[PDB]
């Protein structure tokens with residue numbers, strides 16, 4: 001059994017309802033059990049143009065799946081929520097990102113864990129800190145509570 005942490009986002013449709021549906025679907029795969037869920041945060045989009053605000057949260061899971069089996073379940077959940085994938089990035093019904101998989105470091109063409117951007121993202125670290133404050137991020141070797149920083153663009157929803 002491995003303790004893993006997922007980052008969820010939605011910035012189109014009924015964001016909260018899609019996030020709650022996504023959690024229920026994730027928990028329903030064999031080999032995945034949701035053990036904790038952060039508060040929901042409304043977050044300013046980063047890394048792109050002006051876009052609709054996201055709802056983001058993190059989820060703790062207990063899993064017996066390999067990290068690539070877990071990735072398949074995450075992507076399938078996005079498909080269940082009818083995520084659109086066009087030539088350019090745009091708003092999405094659901095994004096399910098693997099943030100941490102135990103203390104493993106995985107670098108494969110289709111998978112990087114810990115997520116390559118998480119340590120510089122308030123929309124990840126703030127909700128992650130609500131449920132994983134003492135979890136070690138194995139690249140930096142810091143606890144999440146030592147990575148998290150204050151960011152006014154992330155607000156409790």
Ligand SMILES: Nc1ncnc2c1ncn2[C@@H]1O[C@H](COP(=O)(O)CP(=O)(O)OP(=O)(O)O)[C@@H](O)[C@H]1O
Nearest residue numbers: 071074095096097098099110111112113114115117
């Ligand atoms: N830690 C991870 N979690 C989920 N997908 C990951 C991943 N690392 C790599 N990927 C790969 O990334 C591919 C594209 O996923 P997208 O969800 O479109 C990226 P995004 O989440 O919008 O950007 P972000 O990674 O900056 O958050 C997936 O098909 C998957 O194979």
Ligand SMILES: Nc1nc2[nH]c(SCc3ccc(Cl)cc3)nc2c(=O)[nH]1
Nearest residue numbers: 009043044045046048051054090091
């Ligand atoms: N707040 C926040 N910013 C994020 N940026 C990304 S990747 C680039 C990106 C892609 C499409 C759009 Cl429409 C906006 C930004 N993901 C998140 C997320 O989940 N939350």
Ligand SMILES: [Mg+2]
Nearest residue numbers: 009095096097
């Ligand atoms: Mg993402």
Ligand SMILES: [Mg+2]
Nearest residue numbers: 095096097098
């Ligand atoms: Mg993603």
Ligand code: NA
Nearest residue numbers: 027028029032
């Ligand atoms: Na399950």
Ligand code: NA
Nearest residue numbers: 107108109112
């Ligand atoms: Na790589």
